[PDB]
Amino acid sequence: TDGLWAALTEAAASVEKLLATLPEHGARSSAERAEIAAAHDAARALRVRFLDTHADAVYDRLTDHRRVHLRLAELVEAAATAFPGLVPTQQQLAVERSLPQAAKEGHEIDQGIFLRAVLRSPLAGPHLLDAMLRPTPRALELLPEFVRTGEVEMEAVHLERRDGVARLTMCRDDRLNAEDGQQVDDMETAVDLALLDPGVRVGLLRGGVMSHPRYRGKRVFSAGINLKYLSQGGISLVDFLMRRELGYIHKLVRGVLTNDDRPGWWHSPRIEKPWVAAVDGFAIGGGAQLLLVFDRVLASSDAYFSLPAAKEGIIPGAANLRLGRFAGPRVSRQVILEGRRIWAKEPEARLLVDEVVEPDELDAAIERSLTRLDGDAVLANRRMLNLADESPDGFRAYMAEFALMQALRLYGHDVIDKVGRF
Amino acid sequence: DGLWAALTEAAASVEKLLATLPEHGARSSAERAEIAAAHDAARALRVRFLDTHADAVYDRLTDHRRVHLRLAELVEAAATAFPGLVPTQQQLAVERSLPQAAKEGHEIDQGIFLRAVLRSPLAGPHLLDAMLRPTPRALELLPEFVRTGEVEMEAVHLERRDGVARLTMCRDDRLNAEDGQQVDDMETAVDLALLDPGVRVGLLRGGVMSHPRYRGKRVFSAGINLKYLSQGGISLVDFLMRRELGYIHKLVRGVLTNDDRPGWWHSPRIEKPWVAAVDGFAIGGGAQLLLVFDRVLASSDAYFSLPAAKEGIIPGAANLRLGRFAGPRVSRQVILEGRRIWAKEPEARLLVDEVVEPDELDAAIERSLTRLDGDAVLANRRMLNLADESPDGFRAYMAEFALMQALRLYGHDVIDKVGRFG
Amino acid sequence: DGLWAALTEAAASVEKLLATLPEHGARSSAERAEIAAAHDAARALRVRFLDTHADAVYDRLTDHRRVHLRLAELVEAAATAFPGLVPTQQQLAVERSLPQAAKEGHEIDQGIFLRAVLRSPLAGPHLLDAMLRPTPRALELLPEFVRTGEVEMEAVHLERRDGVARLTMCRDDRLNAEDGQQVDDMETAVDLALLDPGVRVGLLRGGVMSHPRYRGKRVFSAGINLKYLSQGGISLVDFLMRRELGYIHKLVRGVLTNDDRPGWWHSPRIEKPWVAAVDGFAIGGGAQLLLVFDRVLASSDAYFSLPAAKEGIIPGAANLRLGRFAGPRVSRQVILEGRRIWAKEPEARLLVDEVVEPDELDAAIERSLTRLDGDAVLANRRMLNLADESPDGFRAYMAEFALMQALRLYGHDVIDKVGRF
Amino acid sequence: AIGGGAQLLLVFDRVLASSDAYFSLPAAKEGIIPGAANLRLGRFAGPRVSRQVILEGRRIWAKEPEARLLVDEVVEPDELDAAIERSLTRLDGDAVLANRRMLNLADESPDGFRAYMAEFALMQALRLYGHDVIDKVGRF
Ligand SMILES: CC(C)(COP(=O)(O)OP(=O)(O)OC[C@H]1O[C@@H](n2cnc3c(N)ncnc32)[C@H](O)[C@@H]1OP(=O)(O)O)[C@@H](O)C(=O)NCCC(=O)NCCNC(=O)Cc1cc(O)cc(O)c1
Ligand SMILES: CC(C)(COP(=O)(O)OP(=O)(O)OC[C@H]1O[C@@H](n2cnc3c(N)ncnc32)[C@H](O)[C@@H]1OP(=O)(O)O)[C@@H](O)C(=O)NCCC(=O)NCCNC(=O)Cc1cc(O)cc(O)c1
Ligand SMILES: CC(C)(COP(=O)(O)OP(=O)(O)OC[C@H]1O[C@@H](n2cnc3c(N)ncnc32)[C@H](O)[C@@H]1OP(=O)(O)O)[C@@H](O)C(=O)NCCC(=O)NCCNC(=O)Cc1cc(O)cc(O)c1
User: Among residues B77, B194, B83, which one has the least CA distance to residue B127?
Assistant: First the structure.
């Protein structure tokens, strides 16, 4: 119509023709590498140009003019079948997923371009964000059993209702709560259950006792993303990096968007609750990022917080969005641009942590904190605070650039090389 | 679309239940649940109606945004032009004659209304401009104030001296506890200070108290009058919304005048710098006021708190402004957990520019007043306030605040706590 | 409609009064009040006209936002296409030959114009993109800079070394006091640093001074040239607005290039990280620069001030950015009351990452340059700057600033103070 | 205040400094003993800071927090004259005289001062003729 779809289709065909005829990734000459790299670039450039003008119409076809909420995975899958060449097919992703990161063609980058244009739209963006705030099907499935038993054991998370508290314990005892696609699914499911359970008033996130010999008997909050899986090709742009930000982490802030099925929905369409985080040992990378959204943060006297991948790492989620608010532009750049580690007992830890407690008094201090966040006053006040701290436009515009910026970093040679050495 | 008719019907059901059911407090649980469901259905339709019709409703009331109406006039004109949308003057009179525990909560409808009005990018800014205009009372008193340099009001004493508008809050029997009359006096005094060409700088300070526990001691503010709040005499519109959109916003942005002087084309509002001096303490609404001044001095023995963390209403615009001053951790410590901050602790410097011993405070106040005189200050504080708080940011917050605060004003926890004071 | 005719009417009255009345300073009180009233009526109509017509005015000048024009070209094309809206080149030359105290203040009309342009959600972002594009001067000098690794300019020395673009401000006789030429050199150097593929990180430092009170000592910046400001040589457009929308904004957002390289579809601007090293002091415009760098070092004896709290012009975008660094109390202490902040006091850490003894300063500057190399920094500092300062936030501020600063540039208190320096 | 001048500050009842001032006993590598600083500095700054200053030549700036170990008031150049004058009026009475006598007696015993100055007389004499000192001082 303006020719952009036809040009994209053409440029995608050239890519598929080079991938069919050229040797495997590791066997390509420099001229072959430069040729496919140029074809990828031409195709992706046209993905951007097409969506610059057609994003809203593309989204409208997929969601019936914003009348059906689709989560990220369903959205990019429906976009692949309805707009071939715009984003990779399930089959193309499975081929990618079976390769180590160093050998991938980087088809996820197209999903970054796509989600970029979707989140930039003032119509499509807020709708997709609402879609990710709704309860996961898995949580709705497990909710009756959780109301009954007060307990759910998941692969990466243990959830227990006790004294009105949703106790989320991250329990990957062999690898220091290193994050993966399954951890995100469990965290979101647990986060959904806590919010939907009327017997839960406050949530608590803590790391469990580790079993690895260097930490045996010691709790550890988070060692951040699983670098082994990232090297091996198992960290999904959509199902890990974007899902965690638009899903459970955003629900910690804004709650779960429910159906119009209860009183008061006209004033509170989302159910939100206050959250307490307790940091044992350390919070690193993705785990440090989580602390920027809790209502109360406690840490053991020996803990530290870092976003360590300053030279050859991916973007630390929404830390770049939120850290300036906590620490100011100098400290946030010291932390992110230069990898400054902040210790629980140094004065600037009070920018990130409310309470630092000696190991032998921490359990009791955690329990006291849980009783202080009970009321309706807290619910109203933290809603107004989060609204002031982080506007819908601010979050949307950031996650918009993040979708593409992070996709590129996930395929950067410096990242692949570093992660390979872990 | 049928929404007006559905609302009219649902409001009829409410009025019929109120006519037939027994008085508040004599109702059974089935009767209480029935009227609660009727209120909920009507209010849900108030929201839906205004979601699509707010701009047209506002246009009828203001002649397509060509007549500026203040809050009281707006909600009163909306009641007569759109029966059932917001309560009539007579329905409000009945409510106002009841203790808060017995009210049906018709003000909540005004919260719904003002929320939708402020959410409109067309209706919202016009209403905010209307509240920035000088009050009729101030225009009335302006000539005598220019002549005399003095006005004695019930809750405020205003004196022009050395180019300073000295506002002294002088409710000496109740620690300057706030009520509807205090707001009217404060706005009148702020209006006079800004309109008076003999005033260059404003000063807000608490007067000498006469209550036995504080006799001979100045006190800044003990916050909202909790007795009146329990008794039903705190108005959502004429107190909680009026102070935020009126005098407090005028401290930031000045008074919007007519096109009646040179330079109006670059400065349609008259703004001046303000100094606050805190004796004894600043609590609740009085603490909120400090987030808006150009200079804040405090006595060495003063403290600052927003104390109603468990069972209180939202602390005005503190939830909007405190994060900017103290960051997300300290602002939640203060608001979510009621942390009190003392003038001599290091973190008081987040809220206070100067902490001075009682016997050197008067002179330090006078010195501070001479430092804010020029045209440079005027331009710089205009640019600073513009950067600190965008029009959209303030509007969007006050929109949600209008409804969120209305709900809190009728919350059972609030009513119960407030009943127990004094 | 009718606003253009009324404006044309009011501008004619002004021109006819300026033709018949005596020179500025020879005017009586009645004559001064008459021309002041005429200026006021004309400027009021400039605002009212542009309130409704800004976008069409801009569309005529830029071919419906299809041609990028820089500030100087924009206001000059507006002068030729809409006579009386903004001053002509000839009217500006007359103004430029007068001391500030004698000017009619025709720049104020440009402030009105740029305010209305930047306020438009269509015209504003377009003008901002135009100022992010490389200056022609820089494109001209780029091939020799790639070859030689060195450019000597009047106010700036630029050297590529070890992948670092070393900008040394080298006005050794006046403590690097700023003027129109310094801005042109700074933007040219910043452009070169960003366009040069051999540069990975930029460094801004003050050079060794030659004035007797500072001989042999480096000094970062003494702020705007107050002598030139008194004499009428500080241009609203070519200095005060140019520096904010050009080289200072390029430090944040990079240079907008043509679609001429791989990856432009994700990175249409080339940005790089910047280090600032403050010797002696950073004052006024020089202190403003520090709110925009990725790393800031200072010598133990340095201080930072925005000193003109009583009788000064607005300190550029400090009013926009300082609150983010220091909070609303400190930022008002600095700007409203002229509080000076010393490198060794605790709150210096709000503005400065590292404070170092003079004898160890060169070495930590060098260490800092090696820490900002990767692709990780580039991605992270883009996301940080995006979170820190939204396009709307910057645009809306610079819109009001265009007029607010124009008025301050002609304020009697400013002219008087600056005359005494 | 450098060397002998910084030493003097350990003996005053009130010390004011301009915001741009610094205090050092700089000759840590090749200098003579800084008078009675080794006797008095520990009392003001503790054993860690006094060794940082004396053993390692740490320079202390008027605006850093630890300057308050040595200085009572740090004032901007344009307000310093007036701040000096105010300080002079606050030390007038007979009460100050009695109190500063009792303080100095508690702070520095006769035996302590004497025992230090006894060893100092010889230790400093040796340093005054040390080859490192002579060499370093020749290069100034
Ligand atoms: C914490 C440590 C210093 C501890 O070191 P030691 O005390 O020497 O213990 P180790 O033996 O390394 O750890 C014990 C155990 O855990 C394993 N371990 C520890 N951390 C990890 C991670 N992060 N991944 C995988 N495996 C891990 C380690 O391999 C050992 O297992 P075996 O090899 O089977 O023995 C170390 O584990 C470490 O440096 N880990 C890497 C930390 C790191 O760089 N994490 C990633 C940071 N970056 C992100 O999170 C990026 C991110 C995450 C997100 O969620 C979102 C987003 O947008 C971006
Ligand atoms: C400050 C105090 C601790 C002083 O304690 P004491 O030294 O024991 O003094 P008291 O004898 O109680 O005070 C003296 C005197 O003032 C009366 N007093 C003090 N504060 C009040 C208030 N707020 N209301 C009514 N009466 C009051 C107190 O009842 C005594 O009167 P008598 O009965 O005549 O003796 C105490 O008075 C107190 O707790 N006061 C109330 C504090 C409080 O929680 N105030 C409300 C805070 N919440 C808001 O402002 C909420 C708000 C305000 C807004 O403006 C806008 C908005 O959106 C939200
Ligand atoms: C820095 C100083 C304290 C140093 O004082 P001393 O140590 O006593 O040295 P001086 O002998 O005064 O300085 C040596 C030398 O530099 C010259 N010098 C120093 N500062 C200046 C300035 N600002 N202009 C011109 N010449 C200067 C001074 O005139 C001497 O020249 P000669 O007399 O010809 O020898 C002093 O020079 C001073 O007070 N300077 C003025 C500081 C000032 O107000 N600067 C401007 C502040 N305002 C802005 O930056 C405004 C601004 C700038 C922008 O870029 C953007 C914007 O929006 C707003």
Answer: B77
Superfamily classification of domain C134-421: 2-enoyl-CoA Hydratase; Chain A, domain 1 (3.90.226.10)
CA proximity to B337, closest of A271, A165, A369: A369
Question: Distance from first CA to last CA of chain D, Å, rounded?
Answer: 18
Classify residue D97 by burial, with Cβ atoms within 10 Å: 0-12, 13-18, 19+: exposed
**Within 6 Å (CB) of ligand 2, which residues are found?**
B 174-175, 177-178, 211, 213, 222-227, 240, 243, 283-285, 307-308, 312-316, 422
Q: B335 is written with which tokens?
A: 């608001």
- Cβ atoms of A308 and A248 within 8 Å: the answer is no
Residues of chain C with C-beta less than 8 angstroms from the C-beta of B266: 43, 47, 403-404, 407
User: Domain residues of chain B, as ranges?
Assistant: 1-133, 134-422
Q: Is the CB of A203 under 6 A from ligand 1?
A: no
Helix (H) or strand (E) holding C165: strand C164-169
Resolution in A: 2.5
DSSP secondary structure string, B302-344?
A: -EEE---TTT----TTHHHHHHHHHHHHHHHHHHTT---EETT
Please state, in angstroms and rounded to a whole number, the distance separating the CA atoms of residues B312 and B315.
Answer: 8
Query: What's the CATH fold of domain B134-422?
Result: 2-enoyl-CoA Hydratase; Chain A, domain 1 (3.90.226)
> C171 C-alpha to center of ligand 3: Å?
12
- Chain B residues within 8 A of A385 when measuring between CB atoms: 319, 323, 328, 331-332, 335-336
A199 touches chain C (CB under 8 A): no
C89 is in an annotated binding site: no
Q: Is the CB of A316 under 6 A from ligand 1?
A: yes
CATH number for the domain formed by residue range(s) A135-422 = 3.90.226.10
Q: Experimental technique used?
A: X-ray
Do A164 and A200 form a contact (C-beta atoms < 8 A)? yes
Judged by its nearest atom, the ligand closest to the C-alpha of residue C283 is 3
